[PDB]
């Protein structure tokens, strides 16, 4: 397995859960996290075996609860699109009635602004700490 | 107990019930765009369901996604649980094509709003109910 170049360029790799690599989108919105099952040439969720899907949803829900516990979002959005980047990746985004894309989807509706260095470092450290409380996480 | 949210009822045609999720067809002329709605109250997010319910959900989601792949051969399938305006947990399953009006961006908020042709709607609904019936536990609803 190898993380797709586009996901690597757009994110900070927070660490690895048993199945999915966990990424943080660098854009100043969210937090916007992405789970990437470490399985080669994967296009659709249903292409994973039923058992891989089970581990995926467990990790997905653990990360979603993490977003709920730390950022008290008005709503959480989860999505698997992959129209351009072929490598299966699932977005997990904290949404607010005040964000630039509300109430529509974040995809294709952001300002493109990047999170400040000090802010990025602080968020990454907190996220890694909270992810470490999830079984199997490795930074 | 559980009751389909009025907005989803208005925007869709109920195809039937899988053991956990009600299966709906968005009336808009794009997709096919289906929506799965776990028939359990108090749900706004997937992680709100119990572990057992989540497992049943992902199995139903994949069975429906496989149905979309096998019957419409889309260029890509998109799945999403958004619900910024409709609190009731519902998961979008959409067949995407390089030629659809929203490609390569998301469908949400990027359609023309036009509803599928009447004759086309009846044909698609009937086809979907028949194909969904091949999935374990699916019970068609024609009301
Ligand atoms: Na946000
Ligand atoms: Na982010
Ligand atoms: Na498993
Ligand atoms: Na989840
Ligand atoms: Na995706
Ligand atoms: Na993807
Ligand atoms: Na993947
Ligand atoms: Na979104
Ligand atoms: Na489409
Ligand atoms: Na549709
Ligand atoms: Na969730
Ligand atoms: Na699926
Ligand atoms: Na939704
Ligand atoms: Na929605
Ligand atoms: Na929802
Ligand atoms: Na629901
Ligand atoms: Na094309
Ligand atoms: Na979409
Ligand atoms: Na349209």
The answer to whether A84 faces chain B, any CB pair under 8 Å, is: yes
Encoded tokens for B39 = 């028939």
Please tell me the distance from the alpha carbon of residue B105 to that of residue B69, in angstroms, as a whole number: 19
Question: Is residue A79 within 8 Å of A91, Cβ to Cβ?
Answer: yes
The answer to whether B57 faces chain A, any CB pair under 8 Å, is: yes
The answer to whether B135 faces chain A, any CB pair under 8 Å, is: no
Please report the resolution in angstroms: 1.5
Q: Which residue of A has its CA nearest to B78?
A: A81
Technique that determined the structure: X-ray
Q: Which residue of A has its CA nearest to B109?
A: A104
Lateral strand order in the sheet of B12-17: A11-16, A20-25, A32-37, A90-95, A75-80, B76-81, B91-96, B33-38, B21-26, B12-17, B139-140
Give the three-class secondary structure for A61. helix
Distance from residue A40's CA to the centre of ligand 17 (Å): 26
Question: Is residue B91 within 8 Å of B79, Cβ to Cβ?
Answer: yes
Residue whose tokens read 């049943």: B56
Question: Is residue B124 within 8 Å of B28, Cβ to Cβ?
Answer: no
Please tell me the distance from the alpha carbon of residue A74 to that of residue B96, in angstroms, as a whole number: 28
Give the three-class secondary structure for B124. helix
From A118's Cα to the closest Cα of chain B, the distance in A is 30
Question: Is residue B38 within 8 Å of B119, Cβ to Cβ?
Answer: no
A77: nearest CB among B58, B81, B110: B81
Neighbouring-strand partners of residue B16: B23, B140
**Number of residues that this document lists for chain A:** 139
Please tell me the distance from the alpha carbon of residue B23 to that of residue B138, in angstroms, as a whole number: 9
Distance from residue B48's CA to the centre of ligand 13 (Å): 14
Neighbouring-strand partners of residue A16: A21, A138
Q: Domains in chain A, start-ordered, CATH in brackets?
A: 1-139 (3.30.428.10)
Q: Which residue of B has its CA nearest to A50?
A: B59
> Environment class of residue A103 by beta-carbon count within 10 Å: exposed (0-12), middle (13-18) or buried (19+)?
middle
A82–B104 C-beta distance less than 8 A: no
Distance from residue B7's CA to the centre of ligand 4 (Å): 23
Question: Is residue A19 within 8 Å of A38, Cβ to Cβ?
Answer: yes
Query: How far from the centroid of its chain's Cα atoms is residue A116's Cα?
Result: 19
Q: What residues have CB less than 8 Å from A3, skipping those under 6 apart? A: A13, A21, A36, A87
Neighbouring-strand partners of residue B78: B94
Residues of chain A in contact with residue B80, where contact means CB-CB under 8 angstroms, are: 77-81, 105
Q: What residues have CB less than 8 Å from B87, skipping those under 6 apart? A: B5, B44
Please tell me the distance from the alpha carbon of residue A24 to that of residue A12, in angstroms, as a whole number: 5
Q: What are phi and psi of A35, to 5 degrees?
A: -105, 130
Residues of chain B in contact with residue A58, where contact means CB-CB under 8 angstroms, are: 51, 54
Q: A32 to each of A72, B32, B64, how far by Cα in Å?
A: 14, 28, 27
CB count within 10 Å of CB B104 equals: 14
> Environment class of residue B113 by beta-carbon count within 10 Å: exposed (0-12), middle (13-18) or buried (19+)?
exposed
* Torsion from C-alpha of B7, B12, B13, B19, nearest 10 degrees: -80
B47: nearest CB among A54, A61, A108: A61
Q: Which residue of B has its CA nearest to A97?
A: B84
* Torsion from C-alpha of B27, B8, B56, A46, nearest 10 degrees: 40
Give the three-class secondary structure for A6. helix
Please tell me the distance from the alpha carbon of residue A18 to that of residue A38, in angstroms, as a whole number: 9
Give the three-class secondary structure for A131. helix
Please tell me the distance from the alpha carbon of residue B132 to that of residue B9, in angstroms, as a whole number: 19
Question: Is residue B23 within 8 Å of B16, Cβ to Cβ?
Answer: yes
């Amino acid at each position: 397995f190898q993380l797709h170049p586009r996901l690597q360029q757009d994110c900070i790799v927070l660490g690895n859960l048993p199945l999915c690599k966990v990424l943080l989108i660098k854009e100043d919105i969210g937090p916007w996290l992405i789970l990437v099952p470490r399985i080669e040439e994967l296009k659709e969720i249903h292409h994973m075996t039923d058992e891989q899907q089970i581990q995926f949803i467990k990790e997905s829900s653990a990360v979603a609860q993490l977003l709920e516990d730390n950022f008290s979002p008005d709503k959480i959005n989860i999505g698997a699109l992959g129209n351009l980047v072929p490598q299966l990746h699932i977005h997990h985004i904290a949404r607010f009635t005040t964000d630039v894309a509300w109430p529509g989807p974040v995809w294709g509706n952001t300002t493109g602004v990047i999170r400040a260095q000090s802010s990025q470092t602080q968020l990454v450290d907190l996220l890694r700490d909270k992810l470490s409380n999830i079984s199997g996480f490795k930074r």
